[PDB]
Amino acid sequence: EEIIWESLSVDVGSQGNPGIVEYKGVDTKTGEVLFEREPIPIGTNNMGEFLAIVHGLRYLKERNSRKPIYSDSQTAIKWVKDKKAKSTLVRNEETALIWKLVDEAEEWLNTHTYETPILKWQTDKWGEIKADYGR
Template structure:
């Protein structure tokens, strides 16, 4: 289904017919303001009206930890880095089929993932670890040392710092692909200096991480 993208604040404000065109004008711009719409008429009207800051709700603190906030809601937290990406994993069973993905923190949820891998057999912690390393390697390849990587997994962040995936995943043919990826990720960490910050996503304050698969069991 065709989406239309409005850029109010970026390298070239306007209305664009593809996410690629929109992304080109907002990537790396601190505080870029943009949004997707279902019709051209709606997008043009929104562009003409100018950017409307989301209304801040007054009153008691809302329980957000099990919700995913919109980019507009997240923009109310100045401590969230505007030039950032987020990674998250999902696993059906533990071990089970694991997958992970990466998104721009302030991207509209309808926009495509930066990358998505899986499912293959493994565990949630292994997928969280591989997701962070995949993101860091991608940024290094792009020559980008500024973008912040958010993860909601303390274990995975610790393993990345220690350059070692401390999993108890058995060395059996079923998990061979996961172990091969772990070995490559550890090798990359040992051979490269990480300059991008990896920061813990504060779920209790900011809701579910934007890369969340939305399949958590409550």
């Protein structure tokens, strides 16, 4: 209903899907960029959205922050809830990097705890998430 401005927002950016994947996290209130992942040569939009949330979890945990995370990705929110990224992307030599990061993110979720609420950014009511790439 109301934006929780005291929060972290994350988003993926890509060149192609599958294609070059990156992601970032911003302070919802100000747009300040808090983290950015170096581009990964081949991945999917949803793998990037998933990695972005998990990185946000790890970022806030390290800083003892109880802020929620906003994502616009129905898929990635569910994957994080399940601790399982159900991606269709073929596992081969050229997707090995994205799949390593996805596998490592699942592994982190399965060995750590957090109470961070992971919230759906309501794009239809609020406009584009503040972490959007503008592509």
